[PDB]
Structure 1
């Protein structure tokens, strides 16, 4: 029953066969100290050529070997405050940071690794490797892991890798299309035959129940567009586009930075609690931002970019939320809503309700289905400001 801003703001394009294709160019350089990954929603995998940044694999440029090694790493997720490695424990895994920040405390907190950093190099070659630092995850993120035994197996498989290892001991264009498959929001509406036969004259309780079902399906559509893992703006956003607040509350400098990272931002999406926190920051700064009109409706905005409330953005137990800045369009590479219309039996242009059967207990079943998905044409179309403290008040 709440407002679904993402449903009414995302342009909808018609897919053919319930699938869409987005052509991705992933420019990366070898030797700059940062490993680049390929991200398909929440699943990430290291580019094989970038594996070479690792010294023990520098100048090795055999596609088979690199592809095998890249295929043999395992993705892991870490939460805030979680310890990944402990001092004293023998080192046996190479960890490549794909997202999040990880603080390493030595025997003296050395520093904080970030996206594209590596720790666990020496663990690959020798068995004497021992963790001398404790890695505490300051922020939630992902991490690729290459175990020593698996790498040893890959070495024992390819003679070229063996020879290169024995010898060492003494902008790239990569096109890879991304395929989006339409997801389904489905439900079964069970209407008793008596309710369909009698209560249908002045108002149809069958039609009202169908309306409630459609509203629930639309709410689920919005919740999935925001929070789904495969597709979904919160998770299917580039790791470079995800920013951290400078202080923790959503100060206007953070909004300026969020607008800096991409051209032609269309709007902001945030929880109403987050919008209240942003308003508190505006009042503290002493500035009164203007309000702009979309669709004949006035709405708060920052620098002319409307800020739209979305209750589907999660609030963590630590009372920290996130803000989304996103541009929408097809002619301008942005975020589109993939949806197929012209279904065989449409109650609504995107919907399909079809009679299933009548049970022995005289209960009619209807199948209400809708097909939807989200596509982000270019990486710099959705930016996420994370760890936004929304329970901060003046003191």
Structure 2
């Protein structure tokens, strides 16, 4: 029953056969100290060529072997404040950081590793390796793990790798298409036969129940478009596009930085609590931003970019939310809504209601279905500002 801004702002394109294909270019250079990954929503995997940045694997350029080694790592997720390794415990895993920041405290907090960093190199070769620093995850993120035993097995598999390891001991174009499959929001509406036979003259309680069902389906559509793992702007956004606040509250400097990272930003999406926090920051700074009109409707904006409320963005127990800056379009590579119309029996252009059966208890069943998905044409189309403290007040 709430306002659905993402549904009415994202353009909808018609897929054929319930599938879509997006061609991805992944530019990456070796030697720069950062490992680049391939991300498919929430599932991530290291680029096989990038894997060569590791010294113990430098100058090895057999595509088969690198691909196998890349395939044998395991993805793990860590929450804020969770301890991953502890000082004193023997080291047996190589950790490649894909997202988040992790502060390492030695026996003296050395520094904080971030996206593209590695720790655990020496643990791979010798069995005497011991963790001398404690890594505490300051921010939630992902991390790839390469076990010593698996790499040893791969070494015992390829003779070329043995010889290269024994000898050492003494812009790249990568095309890989991404396939999007239409997800379904489905439900069963059970209407008693009496309610369909009698209550049908001045208003249809069947039609009113169907409208309520459609509204619930649309709310689920928005919640999935925001929070789903395979597709979904919160999770299926490039790791480089996700920024951290300088101080924690959503100061206007953070909004300027969020607008810096991409061209032609269309709008901001944030929780209403987050919008209140941004307004508090604006009042503290003493500036009054203008409001712009979209569709004959006035809306708060920053630098002319409208800020739209979305209640489906989660609020963490620590009262920290996130802000999304995103451009929409097909001619300009942005975010599109994949949706198939022309269904066999449409109550609405995107909907399909079909009579299922009548039970022995005289209850008619209807199947209400809609098919939807989201596509991001280029990586630099959605930026996310994370860990935004929304419970800060002037003191």
Q: Does the TM-score normalized on the shorter chain lie above 0.5?
A: yes
Aligned with 2:301: secondary structure? strand
Aligned with 2:100: secondary structure? coil
1:172 Cα deviation after fit: 0.4
Q: Deviations over 1:60-105 (max 9, x none)?
A: 0000100000000000000000001000100000000000000011
Aligned with 1:235: secondary structure? coil
Give distance in 1, aligned partners of 2:167 and 2:86: 32
Give distance in 1, aligned partners of 2:89 and 2:162: 28
Give distance in 2, aligned partners of 1:300 and 1:371: 32
1:163 Cα deviation after fit: 0.8
Give distance in 1, aligned partners of 2:159 and 2:128: 24
1:377 Cα deviation after fit: 0.3
Give the equivalent residue in structure 2 for 1:53.
53
Segments of structure 1 that go 5 or more residues without pairing to the other structure are none
Aligned with 1:175: secondary structure? coil
Give distance in 1, aligned partners of 2:100 and 2:160: 35
Give distance in 2, aligned partners of 1:130 and 1:62: 31
Q: Deviations over 1:342-382 (max 9, x none)?
A: 00000000000000000011111000000000000000000
Give the equivalent residue in structure 1 for 2:78.
78
Give distance in 1, aligned partners of 2:140 and 2:161: 35
Give the equivalent residue in structure 1 for 2:134.
134
Give the equivalent residue in structure 1 for 2:332.
332
Aligned with 1:34: secondary structure? coil
Give distance in 2, aligned partners of 1:353 and 1:125: 61
Give distance in 2, aligned partners of 1:197 and 1:57: 75
Q: State the aligned residue count.
A: 395
1:322 Cα deviation after fit: 0.2
1:107 Cα deviation after fit: 1.1
Q: Deviations over 1:120-176 (max 9, x none)?
A: 001111111110100000000000000001111111111111111111111101010
Give distance in 1, aligned partners of 2:205 and 2:250: 46
Segments of structure 2 that go 5 or more residues without pairing to the other structure are none
Give distance in 2, aligned partners of 1:186 and 1:63: 44
Give distance in 2, aligned partners of 1:131 and 1:162: 27
Give distance in 2, aligned partners of 1:128 and 1:169: 17
Q: Deviations over 1:318-343 (max 9, x none)?
A: 00000000000000000000000000
Give distance in 1, aligned partners of 2:152 and 2:136: 28
Give distance in 2, aligned partners of 1:55 and 1:129: 17
Give distance in 2, aligned partners of 1:319 and 1:179: 36
Give distance in 2, aligned partners of 1:18 and 1:233: 20
Aligned with 1:219: secondary structure? helix
TM superposition outliers: structure 1 runs of 4+ over 2 Å: none
Q: Deviations over 1:8-36 (max 9, x none)?
A: 00000000000000000000011110000
TM alignment of 1:373-388, pairs within 5 A? 373-388=373-388
Aligned with 1:179: secondary structure? strand
Give distance in 2, aligned partners of 1:102 and 1:167: 34
Q: Deviations over 1:285-309 (max 9, x none)?
A: 0000000000000000000000000
Give distance in 2, aligned partners of 1:333 and 1:43: 23
Q: Deviations over 1:197-251 (max 9, x none)?
A: 1111101000000000000000000000000010000000000000000000000
Q: Deviations over 1:265-285 (max 9, x none)?
A: 000000000000000000000
Give the equivalent residue in structure 2 for 1:281.
281
Give distance in 2, aligned partners of 1:48 and 1:16: 33
Instruction: Report the TM-score when normalising by structure 2.
Output: 1.00
Instruction: Report the TM-score when normalising by structure 1.
Output: 1.00
